[PDB]
Design a protein around this ligand. Structure first.
Ligand SMILES: *[C@@H]1O[C@H](CO)[C@@H](O[C@@H]2O[C@H](CO)[C@@H](O[C@H]3O[C@H](CO)[C@@H](O)[C@H](O)[C@@H]3O)[C@H](O)[C@H]2NC(C)=O)[C@H](O)[C@H]1NC(C)=O
Ligand SMILES: OC[C@H]1O[C@@H](O[C@H]2[C@H](O)[C@@H](O)[C@H](O)O[C@@H]2CO)[C@H](O)[C@@H](O)[C@@H]1O
Ligand SMILES: OC[C@H]1O[C@@H](O)[C@H](O)[C@@H](O)[C@@H]1O
Length: 358
């Protein structure tokens, strides 16, 4: 649309991902590969506010971005993920979320939002783009027969509404997570998804700051594939562009001129999954298309790197309390460390298999 959040702004690079990458690159032995790995710290990515413990980090990024903009004559933009719902990841075998519905989880989540808003409010010369709650609303389209999801539904909707309503008050541009082509892009899922997202947008007052939806977050789908990945058989929407081209008109019909962002951070290598639903640490993944507003789609504001490649999606250790068995499938790189922690061998392959090359 007319207002693409990224136009006219310089993205603030994550110093934390930058710190992870710098430490990772010096351990890569081939000198040509190590220098390519180091350059990954210059590629814009999203900061995951996966716990209240991450909020102080957010505050430093806003203030730093503000100072960098003044030092360079630029307007700065900070990219974040809101990812702390109570009973988070309701359909997963295991979740790392710190809040539970049964222990005032919604109230604790709303205080988490309040703390984030209180940071953002202090730095009005820094633009913020937020992805809202990966692995939440999508579960409420297709996974209502999972008891935890049925039991989480009202809390997910209330908590996401609180996030949208209150982040809008400080001018945050927001994209609700909307799964990916293999999740909500099945033709039969497009209408229930649109109905849910539209109800969410309406409950939050149709704020213009609610730009639309984020897709492929932490996944591996192509934006545009010349040949469908065999995992996609039965779904004519075999890539993200097909999914977005199908869903967007349903949102527009409701009066929401929605736009989209698409994660491509681990999409450089296609045809690496046995089944489409295999999501954990998929072996052989490569860094994908670099972030850009040159998307070639009327509906897509930016290609982005939301999931930071190299941070594990979960342990393959079946004895860990956080073990998700998806992370031990044959197509999951193993052994793998606990979710969020650095997975050095995975990062090195992401670098080696990057497409376009680094
Ligand atoms: C795979 O899963 C296990 C994690 O649940 C882990 O085994 C456990 O590792 C911890 C850390 O060594 C041990 O807990 C220790 O905690 C205190 C430290 O303050 C020590 O004083 C205790 O002696 C205790 O050892 C657990 O005992 C241990 N549990 C078992 C059954 O072995 C494995 O290490 C994990 N393996 C990998 C590769 O990740
Ligand atoms: O896309 C990353 C995201 O996947 C989640 O699992 C989805 C999966 O993407 C989808 O293909 C399948 O159809 O449904 C599952 C949920 O049942 C996963 O739970 C997340 O941890 C992950 O971030
Ligand atoms: O989105 C960020 C923008 O929000 C506006 O309210 C501020 O006045 C601008 O300085 C800032 O660049």
């Amino acid at each position: 649309s007319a207002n693409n959040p990224w136009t006219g702004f310089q993205i603030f690079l994550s110093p934390y991902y930058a710190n992870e990458v710098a430490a990772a690159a010096k351990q890569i032995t081939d000198p040509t590969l190590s220098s390519k790995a180091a350059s990954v710290a210059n590629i814009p990515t999203f900061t995951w506010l996966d716990s209240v413990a991450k909020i102080p980090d957010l505050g430093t990024y806003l203030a730093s971005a503000s100072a960098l903009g003044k030092s360079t004559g630029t307007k700065q933009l900070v990219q974040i993920v809101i990812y702390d719902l109570p009973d988070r990841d309701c359909a997963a075998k295991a979740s790392n979320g710190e809040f539970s519905i049964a222990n005032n989880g919604q109230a604790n989540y709303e205080n988490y939002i309040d703390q984030i808003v209180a940071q953002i409010q202090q730095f009005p010369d820094v633009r913020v783009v937020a992805v809202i709650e990966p692995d939440s609303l999508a579960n409420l389209v297709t996974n209502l027969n999972v008891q935890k999801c049925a039991n989480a539904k009202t809390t997910y909707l209330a908590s996401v509404n609180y996030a949208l309503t209150n982040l809008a008050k400080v001018g945050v541009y927001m994209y609700m997570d909307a799964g990916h082509a293999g999740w909500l892009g099945w033709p039969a899922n497009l209408s229930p998804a649109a109905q849910l997202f539209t109800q969410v947008w309406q409950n939050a007052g149709k704020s213009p700051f609610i730009k639309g939806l984020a897709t492929n977050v932490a996944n591996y789908n192509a934006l545009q594939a010349a040949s469908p990945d065999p995992i996609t058989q039965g779904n004519p929407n075999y890539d993200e562009i097909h999914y977005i081209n199908a869903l967007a008109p349903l949102l527009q019909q409701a009066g929401w001129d929605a736009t989209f962002i698409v994660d491509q951070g681990r999409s450089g290598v296609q045809n690496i999954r046995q089944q489409w639903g295999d999501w954990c640490n998929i072996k052989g993944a490569g860094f994908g298309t670099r972030p850009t507003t040159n998307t070639g789609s009327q509906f897509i504001d930016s290609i982005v790197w939301v999931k930071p490649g190299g941070e594990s999606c979960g342990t393959s250790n079946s004895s860990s309390p956080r073990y998700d068995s998806t992370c031990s499938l044959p197509d999951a790189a193993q052994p793998a460390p606990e979710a969020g922690t650095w997975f050095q061998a995975y990062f090195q392959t992401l670098v080696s298999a990057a497409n376009p090359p680094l």
